[PDB]
């Protein structure tokens, strides 16, 4: 049986991720806005079912719930052409639309007051999952509702089920802009510590790095949310077409990250997608060759992830797989991986085996592909850490300035201290500080 | 490499060696016992020493030319020139 | 004549043979050289054939 | 890799050469104005990675970077044809367009105003080279803004890029006519003290002998300087085609020079070039002999430089190498150094070995030559620390005179003092000695502590 996936959906951010998601999967599997298989979705290539679950014979429904705890978005939602596409069972939306008031605290307050409800959505969407592999979170970690709310679900969800894998989306507060929400590093530090404890791995999606990308490399002038989010939409479909598409190896989501996380710490990835272009680009199809296409892959400019410049740790890829989709020559792959280790185009760990996987996928034939090959890199980075030590530095900044303390003192969670988010910044300074360990030598003897 | 007898013998003793450790490690849920430990130690012998062999039957080849694709293999393999560094050999597991 | 030149392009091998394998192409052979100094620099007991035809191919 | 040469292209003259190079550059490669190229260009072994960078699939960009302090020239290289030839991000303008007024001191502090934008810009080129050998500088040395600013990008190119090499085309203050900039001659010493500590070879370009050529040469009444800088163009080309047709020998620029500096100090070259012809003689063409080619070349009639005839020093030629593109008969090759040695027409060094290096090239298939053959000389002769010597005396005559010394006196480098210049004079007295004792045979002890 296919290992079903849920996807949360978290707070603001994090609903309208799982929004465009569901719409880009519908998409790509030609499914209604209803749900159902539109007549020319002939191709039954797919498999719907370790993401999807099936209401009838012909009708794909997502494995998606979407919760949040302010109303406006949910319903927004609802109020789409793609509210019947989702199981209606699988949505929990909160009566009181108030939201989290952006506080951590008061999101993990009201998951503890929605626990029973949540866990009996969870419940009833597991007994219709036949082979359930883990809960997918889509949330932001700087908010209230996506941050506290997120990190409430994560604790319930390893309480209840602790043998099954959590992986989790997690959008990170864009470390660029000064943000408004002052206790966003204790939102922040709290997501990291659920993450930390709870989660096996953790993506990290810098708002930052979306924003980043979205300007320099999309020519968006001002990005829209909207156009953020159907890119992260794109990515999850591109990082979920080898489980669309059956074949020899990474079968499924579980064993794809597995590779990855060689310890419970070093669950940090890296992302890479391809082609990358430009939305004023698309008119020049380049006959790239995969040697080609991985040298674009290799430019940092087509990296998914905007790790800063840390000029002290000689930061280095800790591991990279390529998954490729599209039309590929082996011979070229291989040309590709001599090239990329002859030009030294990546650094790798020193104390292990580490090397670039390179995976060929098929592209979903429910998605008409406008590219010959598509590809997604998947890497661990010491750079990451870069990100990590900005979030820390960010944590202990806050926790310094006692910023927007006051409204989390009004939440039990944070009513009496902030040690929790102290903790959760020591604790991540102490990743951003292993991870320069692997990116040296002594990781081999690191945590001895 | 199913031609490559020896290769394949060598090959097929280094994959009931994987086998025979994930039975270890899904024996002990918790800390390896002294039993556990004593068969990780065993195991991780026998990888070292076979994926040293693995190294020298490859270099053995390159002598003679024989195969380009265990050659690629090899190449992939050894991508950090982690087990380059390491001789050939799987890195030593640290307990 | 005709046979060897279409089938065998033995005058294009030999062309072949003044370009590469006489050197007449010398400025794959300096780089090829210039990637070989920190391999050829190593001991021979050193050298991995894998490693030197990647950077041929490379060089290539 | 390819040994990437970046070109810097320093103020109204050497961005004006800068960009002539770029043409000519392109019509030797079959590259359209456009940066497209053509499809005549079918001949795959020309080595565009040395000096050109691909843009994308199908345009390849010089890695050439046009630097002007004043706007207008740099306007109207952006107005050409070529607009899109060169990478715009390389392509600096300054915003004043006042340029440095012929001050080498002005110059030199704009340069370090612009200091930290010129060397992102550089630095951004550099990592777009996988295997850079250096870069190359095209400017004046008796003007403002290419001199000033060319020292001052020597020292910070010296400090960001201390190991990798310097190749300048340094346009040397014409030596026969009266220069309007009477502090030209702190300029040139200025100039020549940078490159005396922070270039590592200097082209000398003398306007003087550019004119006298284009005049007596080019028989043009009235050269203009569009025809003085498609000469420097040719020069180029041909200081070039060791890049554009590999071969088994001399396929870097190091490579090539390498033969031809034997020490550090005597990192002056001199060049030649041939045939050089009328627009009009291409009708004829003459089988010309290697013999006949090195004997049209030994003609100081055909040096692309002016040197005086000095009747107290025996200058002589230290090292020859002569670049020859077209067919050539190698046995006729081997013929002709034999009867040129017989016939002792050049003097060598009496301190070292010393030959006339001969390289023979193929043309550019994607240029149509009128020529069968055309060829380059470079020379090391003694006579070109004359042409130092002038300038030295020009330097002198204006120190005595306090010629325009008030404007630089406005400038930090010369407001406390000139011991730069003096400096710089004493540096260029003890090149000219040193040169004068490398033409000696106890130029073995030249240089030596002992001495």
């Given at each position: 049986m296919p290992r079903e996936i849920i996807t949360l959906q978290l707070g603001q951010c994090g609903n309208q991720i799982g929004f465009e998601f569901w719409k880009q999967l519908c998409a790509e599997h030609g499914?209604?806005?209803?749900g159902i298989v539109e007549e020319?979705?002939?191709?039954?290539?797919?498999?719907?079912?370790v993401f999807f679950y099936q209401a009838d014979d012909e009708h794909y429904i997502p494995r998606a719930v979407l919760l949040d705890l302010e109303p406006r978005v949910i319903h927004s939602i609802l109020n789409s052409?793609?509210?019947?596409?989702?199981?209606?069972?699988?949505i929990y939306l909160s009566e009181?639309?108030?939201?989290?008031?952006?506080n951590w605290a008061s999101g993990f307050s009201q998951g503890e007051k929605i626990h029973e409800d949540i866990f009996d959505i969870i419940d009833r969407e597991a007994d219709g999952s036949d082979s359930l592999e883990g809960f997918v979170l889509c949330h932001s970690?700087?908010?209230?509702?996506?941050?506290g709310l997120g990190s409430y679900l994560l604790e319930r969800l390893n309480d209840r089920y602790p043998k099954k894998l959590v992986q989790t989306y997690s959008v990170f507060p864009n470390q660029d802009e000064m943000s408004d929400v002052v206790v966003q590093p204790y939102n922040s530090l709290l997501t990291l510590k659920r993450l930390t404890q709870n989660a096996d791995c953790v993506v990290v999606l810098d708002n930052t790095a979306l924003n980043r990308i979205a300007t320099?490399?999309?020519?968006?002038q001002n990005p829209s949310f909207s156009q953020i989010n159907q890119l992260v939409s794109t990515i999850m479909s591109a990082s979920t077409t080898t489980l669309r598409y059956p074949?020899?190896?990474?079968?499924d989501l579980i064993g794809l990250i597995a590779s990855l996380?060689?310890?419970?710490?070093?669950?940090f990835l890296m992302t890479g997608y391809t082609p990358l272009t430009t939305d004023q680009s698309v008119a020049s199809v380049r006959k790239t060759t995969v040697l080609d296409v991985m040298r674009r892959l290799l430019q940092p400019k087509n990296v998914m992830v905007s790790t800063?410049?840390?000029?002290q740790t000689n930061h280095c890829y800790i591991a990279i797989l390529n998954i490729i989709q599209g039309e590929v020559d082996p011979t070229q792959v291989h040309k590709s991986l001599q090239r990329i280790r002859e030009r030294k185009l990546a650094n790798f760990i020193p104390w292990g085996p580490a090397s670039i996987q390179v995976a060929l996928s098929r592209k979903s034939p429910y998605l008409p592909s406008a590219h010959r090959v598509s590809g997604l890199m998947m890497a661990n980075h010491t750079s990451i850490s870069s990100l990590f030590e900005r979030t820390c530095r960010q944590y202990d900044k806050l926790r310094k300035r006692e910023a927007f303390l006051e409204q989390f003192r009004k939440?039990?969670?944070?009513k009496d201290n902030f040690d929790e988010m102290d903790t959760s910044r020591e604790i991540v300074q102490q990743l951003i500080d292993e991870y320069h360990a692997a990116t040296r030598p002594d990781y081999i003897s690191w945590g001895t | 490499f199913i031609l490559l007898k020896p290769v394949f013998h060598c090959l097929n003793e280094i994959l009931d060696l994987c086998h025979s450790f994930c039975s270890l490690v899904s024996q002990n849920l918790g800390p390896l016992d002294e039993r556990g430990a004593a068969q990780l130690s065993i195991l991780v012998k026998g990888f070292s020493r076979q994926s040293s062999l693995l190294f020298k039957i490859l270099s053995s080849v390159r002598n003679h030319q024989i195969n380009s694709d265990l050659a690629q293999l090899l190449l992939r393999l050894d991508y950090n020139k982690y087990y380059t560094q390491?001789?050939?050999?799987?890195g030593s597991f640290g307990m | 004549l005709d046979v060897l030149n279409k089938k065998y392009s033995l005058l294009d091998h030999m062309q072949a043979m003044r370009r590469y394998l006489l050197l007449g192409q010398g400025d794959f052979i300096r780089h090829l050289m210039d990637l070989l100094k920190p391999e050829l620099v190593?001991?021979?007991?050193?050298?991995?054939q894998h490693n030197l035809t990647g950077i041929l191919e490379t060089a290539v």
């Open positions: 499914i209604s806005p209803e020319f979705a002939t191709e039954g290539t797919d498999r719907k079912d052409p793609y509210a019947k596409l989702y199981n209606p069972e699988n009181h639309g108030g939201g989290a008031g952006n970690i700087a908010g209230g509702t996506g941050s320099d490399r999309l020519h968006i074949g020899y190896m990474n079968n996380i060689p310890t419970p710490r070093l669950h800063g410049r840390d000029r939440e039990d969670m944070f | 390491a001789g050939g050999t799987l | 190593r001991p021979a007991t050193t050298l991995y």
